[PDB]
Symmetry: D3
Amino acid sequence: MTGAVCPGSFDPVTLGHLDVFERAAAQFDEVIVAVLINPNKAGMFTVDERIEMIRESTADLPNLRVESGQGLLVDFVRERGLNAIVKGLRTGTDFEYELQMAQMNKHIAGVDTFFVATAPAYSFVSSSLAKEVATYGGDVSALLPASVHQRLLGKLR
Amino acid sequence: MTGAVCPGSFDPVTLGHLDVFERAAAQFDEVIVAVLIAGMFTVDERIEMIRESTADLPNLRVESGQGLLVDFVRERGLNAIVKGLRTGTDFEYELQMAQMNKHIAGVDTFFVATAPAYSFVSSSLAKEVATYGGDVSALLPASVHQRLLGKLR
Amino acid sequence: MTGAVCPGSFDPVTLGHLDVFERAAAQFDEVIVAVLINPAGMFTVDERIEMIRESTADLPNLRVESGQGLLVDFVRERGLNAIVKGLRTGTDFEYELQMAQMNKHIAGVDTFFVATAPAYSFVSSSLAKEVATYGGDVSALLPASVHQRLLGKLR
Amino acid sequence: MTGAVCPGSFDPVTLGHLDVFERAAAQFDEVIVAVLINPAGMFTVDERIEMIRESTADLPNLRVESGQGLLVDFVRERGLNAIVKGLRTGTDFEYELQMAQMNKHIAGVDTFFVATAPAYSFVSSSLAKEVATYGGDVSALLPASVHQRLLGKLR
Amino acid sequence: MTGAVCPGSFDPVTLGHLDVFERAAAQFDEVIVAVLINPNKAGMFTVDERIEMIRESTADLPNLRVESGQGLLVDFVRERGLNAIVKGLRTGTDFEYELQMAQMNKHIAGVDTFFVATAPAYSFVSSSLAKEVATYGGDVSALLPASVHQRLLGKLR
Amino acid sequence: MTGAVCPGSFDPVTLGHLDVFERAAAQFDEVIVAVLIAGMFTVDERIEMIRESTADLPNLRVESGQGLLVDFVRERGLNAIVKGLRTGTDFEYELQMAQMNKHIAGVDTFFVATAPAYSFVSSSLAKEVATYGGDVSALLPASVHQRLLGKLR
Ligand SMILES: O=C(O)Cn1ccc2ccccc21
Ligand SMILES: O=C(O)Cn1ccc2ccccc21
Ligand SMILES: O=C(O)Cn1ccc2ccccc21
Ligand SMILES: O=C(O)Cn1ccc2ccccc21
Ligand SMILES: O=C(O)Cn1ccc2ccccc21
Ligand SMILES: O=C(O)Cn1ccc2ccccc21
């Protein structure tokens, strides 16, 4: 009954995210993708859109499920009877901030954070840079799942 | 006649800050905590919270400031800054500012790492965690923690 | 015929920027300084271009132009496929590397990084403006014509 | 059935190592601590294994084994394909990342990194031995049985 | 008449190196690969072997040549009428040391150093890690040019 | 009665080191340069070179040391170390040692960046460059530079 939570805003999910989801699902009995929402700032995609895009690109992972939440990540994790977070690393990750949050999260709730580096091919995509590049016409089709790419272009138009 | 200034917004002061204050006060004759001024606490509240937490440091005082930090330092006859390092410090930006501050006013900056126990608290993360019900009581002065609970509730 | 683009907001241009411009101009047949405008700063795009031209008067193979949108489009539209970017103290290098890999992926454009000289390594447009606003002397860190204009915008 | 390997020389095992072992054992069905021998240190491989077993007596799903050669072969030979590595102050993380990407490429093995607790973040096997050699007290940073053995090797 | 020097021990050359050579050759009129030799410590390959492996994998680059040297890199550069170095960045690069050397090299000889990141696919290979992995049987065939791989295995056997 | 120890091998002392010594001497009543002991110069040579370069610093002295740095510091009634930062400093390792030194002996470590002009020299790189005929005269005290040329030629 091992398990981990993969957290993020996933606005939208990228192939970097999906790589890490797949690794987590391969190494833990269950994985929950936590789509964390700031109720004060809307992103590009609604919560239901974000969840749909993740589900469509994770259909081959039988032990992965997707749920939204807000507030403290460690509460989302513990209320599901888990105490592990799996977080991806990419080029441009603020690792010092991630470390700070990992030590705080262990301190307040006993939850462990495991970091895994995304595959090199997917190491320079981020939701924010993908959106920025696509806004001005750049081709990010190879860095996003099919469940995302044309929906992104749709939002931008 | 040695002295150093420990600058920050301290909104609120943490045990990470206090650890650095104590070290500065142990190694310099005179220490001034510079409360540099839309956060949670007013300048007076932040000053009071620091003063309450530093009552056992006779050679430390707390003053508010505006404008260039180096002017604050120099106008008090000093030319040293002591700055703490924690997990999540943007050290590259601190180094840029240190070199600029030396260039424009001949002020030295000394960096000291906070104790491991207080290395992952920051004013911002403490406020965030407490806002959502997390227990940060081990990371703040007893006084500050009660005040924080007051501002939230 | 070789060439590179040096991109930035240059608000205002610093001696750190100038150092990198000079090194680019010494190593490439053609250099374009791209003054890239956003939706915002202290100097107008025209003022920024003028300050750069004043500072680069001795560089005959360097020209200054404004641009918007995707940097790699600016680069490719001028028949080039290289960017030269400066490094200074406080550069977010991890983000620069992310953008370099992205720019190579989407358009085949290479990015070359060069560290500015130690003397000019701690100036940035933002920090120079901040220090000058409160009366600090940054005249050793900016071209002379820029320092004059900066005082005017503040006074 | 999930599982991971925690690799190192562990000469000697520290409380930083133990912290990471405990977290691995709490999150994976099976953990193997791989004591990997080189062509060399203070403690023999047998002594190191014994010190780890003493320290991990409360972890029934963790076992300790020696190994040589390619780590990913050690991992795959035991039917696993995950490594759990600790991070501390002074870890060469850039090199760890290079090795993680290499290990994924050559064998499909994933590497998960976890930071040790702040209290145990500045101890390392090498620095503990160095401090103890000159009479510094590192007893708060090592399992009790290790600290006893360390004194013996020095005296 | 622009030009740059790409320096290294290249013992052996990797596909990470070759990527950077190709970019340099695309952006400068001439490129010299400088195979820098420590006369006090032999590597795995002799100088002539190193040069042969680079030449065989750079035959499509008409403006690139390969030469060995020792002592100060800036003297190698200036004696060829050049004053630019192009150096690759990969995962595990000691960038702070590279920066130190770049500032020293500018100080003593006026030579500029341009850094370029290797392609993600080739970002985790290094000569040393390739040799180490191959020593213990790991498959590094996709990270090295054909001019290198079986020669490497030969040395190891 | 403030004081700090500036430790290193100083083989040889550079202008980067000297800049940090001067800053330490400006901000602490008492400074001890600890020459911690197969390099180029003997301990006595390194001490002499530092003493020659610091003749204008009345509150600085130079002594050799062995074993734990914290014992060197504590045996002289102090509990502060001042360490310089340059381009190529392994800062993560320095932080590890600082936290260890605080833990085992209550000694604080203050870090200060060298001036930009002296930020890319190190004893090792200076020796390497000079060995192959490079001019490092702008990066070393005048005395040291002549001595270095002597050891090579
Ligand atoms: O996208 C990022 O900034 C980092 N990152 C990359 C993969 C991944 C998976 C889960 C959470 C974060 C992740
Ligand atoms: O809180 C931070 O971000 C860093 N930090 C830690 C202690 C301390 C004391 C004075 C100034 C900053 C300080
Ligand atoms: O100013 C910066 O943030 C970095 N930087 C320094 C020189 C330079 C030249 C072109 C672009 C950026 C450059
Ligand atoms: O000791 C180190 O250098 C890092 N480190 C810390 C805990 C731990 C556990 C397994 C492997 C390495 C680990
Ligand atoms: O291999 C390395 O350590 C770094 N690196 C990567 C490509 C490349 C090309 C020339 C010189 C060094 C280079
Ligand atoms: O030289 C170095 O590696 C760092 N560094 C620079 C100045 C200085 C002074 C004392 C100790 C180390 C110092």
